[PDB]
Amino acid sequence: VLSAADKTNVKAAWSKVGGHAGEYGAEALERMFLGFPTTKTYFPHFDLSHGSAQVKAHGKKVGDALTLAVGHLDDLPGALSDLSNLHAHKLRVDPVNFKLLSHCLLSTLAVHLPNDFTPAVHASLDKFLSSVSTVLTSKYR
Amino acid sequence: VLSAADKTNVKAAWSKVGGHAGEYGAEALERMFLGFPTTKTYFPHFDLSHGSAQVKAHGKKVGDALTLAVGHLDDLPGALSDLSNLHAHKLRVDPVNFKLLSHCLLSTLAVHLPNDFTPAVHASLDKFLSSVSTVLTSKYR
Amino acid sequence: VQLSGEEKAAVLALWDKVNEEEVGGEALGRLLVVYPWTQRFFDSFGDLSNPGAVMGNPKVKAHGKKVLHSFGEGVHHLDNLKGTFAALSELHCDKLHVDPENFRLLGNVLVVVLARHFGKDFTPELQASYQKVVAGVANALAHKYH
Amino acid sequence: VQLSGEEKAAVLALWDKVNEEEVGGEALGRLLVVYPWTQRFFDSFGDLSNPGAVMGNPKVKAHGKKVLHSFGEGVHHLDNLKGTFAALSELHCDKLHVDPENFRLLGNVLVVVLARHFGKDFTPELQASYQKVVAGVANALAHKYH
């Protein structure tokens, strides 16, 4: 589903994200917990307060994973397999929730990188995140 | 997204569909036009009356395509490319409509093959049709 | 929401013949097997790891009956969907946290099961009506949500 | 639907600063480019084959303003969403045949644009409220559907 141009767009956008991927990951989680309450369910063991260390530590792991995917874009299935088993088989995350996190991710990127988050780049990012989600819910399809 | 078991399930189910794939295709179209009116939009040039020759002829083409896919399940992207360009680029079909047709397809299969449409087989068919749809809307993602 | 009067009549006459135990058990079972993330909400029910164990699980069969019973209260109360399901909408949202997308999924599976059971009697025109009803129930269970 | 009163106050104070021409043009533009099947409904507008030509299309900019204007009538009428949008729900459904899924898509893009324009001022807690508003508008445009 990812064309050459999209891969170019995504690699470029993320380079601008740089060492902030972790911070964006955590903020995105926040915006999800606050805007879409149903998702707080997957995280009972977590302190969801508004500047908590778990979301922050979790935020880092998500950014790390997204960075990995950007460096593997041609074999996302191979690079994200540990992750696919976890989300689909153990945690049995409702697939709708991926759409929700994705939206919050784009929301965060827009806040911090307003000049770089052009229409072209937004479209490629959406495509990217749809593709990460599809792999993470493949034990479904 | 398609496991070995699913491929086995799908090949088997369709063999039971046999020479009726055409008829089921047309009925499925009917159930879509009637149950989800918004889809009548893509077909102005068509007589949508309830036993019309166009839907019937169109029904045959859909069944033919689904049969092809069953015989190509390991490279659906290659076998359905003409079709992907058409739906996504020319007709710009809203992707939600694939979900709707899919539901109507399963509805038809259930009506005519009640004994063969077991839970296991229903699940594999859903997976199959989700995969056909994803290829047919790939010029999107 | 309505839909018509020759229509309500056709919907009501089919329900007459719906075995809520049988249809509800299969519908819930179908749900748990096609969409497997819905299994997360039914952990207290025990073994749901495979098609044979779901469809044969007594709690699945029993809960299914309860679901199809309330569906039935829907079908007999189409004038006031939003009132019939209010209590249930609060249960599903405030308490269990089910995304409402899943109501649609269940209503669709319900339609497929009715189709399996009634065959050529479940006409395109009759499915059309039930698609409406099922959409009605799903919206009513999404409502007095917050 | 409501959501709170310290909340309605925060939503209203942001709209004060929303340039409906600028936000609406970009939001509609964003829509046409990320979700490209929505282009089908705007054929009379001419060239929408690429990002530069969409964002720069005068009809896109103008229609966008009209959309964000009605969004605004929404924000100032949260007590009666279902009444403010009734006429519009009939237009979108009976006449244009837009699947209501697309209302959600547009409301989400709207949120992303507000986020782009207001930056750190568009807090998580403030997005939370706007997610509610946008969901409200989308449901109200899906309603008196039939």
Ligand code: HEM
């Ligand atoms: C871009 C999409 C997503 C990515 C890339 C992603 C990635 C990850 C990664 C790498 C972990 C490892 C956590 C660890 O090692 O401790 C994780 C854990 C987890 N994720 Fe996701 N995730 C995504 C979406 C979601 C969604 C939508 C949900 C549900 C709302 C979710 C729920 C969880 C949960 C519950 C854990 C376990 C955390 C724990 O128990 O410590 N994830 N995710």
Ligand code: HEM
């Ligand atoms: C399983 C999913 C689908 C398959 C396999 C499929 C397959 C096909 C095929 C093979 C054709 C060729 C028609 C021809 O040669 O004349 C076609 C045409 C067409 N399809 Fe689909 N289709 C699917 C879903 C849909 C959906 C959801 C829509 C929109 C509601 C749609 C709208 C159309 C239209 C408008 C045409 C052109 C018909 C004409 O102008 O003669 N299709 N489709």
Ligand code: HEM
């Ligand atoms: C047609 C839509 C649905 C209807 C009409 C419905 C109806 C009901 C009813 C009547 C009850 C029991 C209420 C009571 O007596 O206290 C119930 C319980 C429940 N439902 Fe739903 N339901 C629907 C969809 C769903 C979906 C999609 C889920 C997926 C999460 C779900 C999960 C549950 C759970 C977990 C319970 C609690 C069962 C228990 O006691 O452990 N339901 N439902």
Ligand code: HEM
């Ligand atoms: C936030 C949700 C939306 C709102 C509030 C909205 C509002 C409006 C308004 C106010 C008009 C003009 C009404 C008039 O003055 O007569 C309009 C026209 C239109 N809208 Fe929507 N709209 C929304 C979403 C959508 C979506 C998702 C589509 C995609 C199909 C769409 C397609 C159209 C079209 C095709 C027109 C006619 C434009 C023309 O004159 O050619 N709208 N909309």
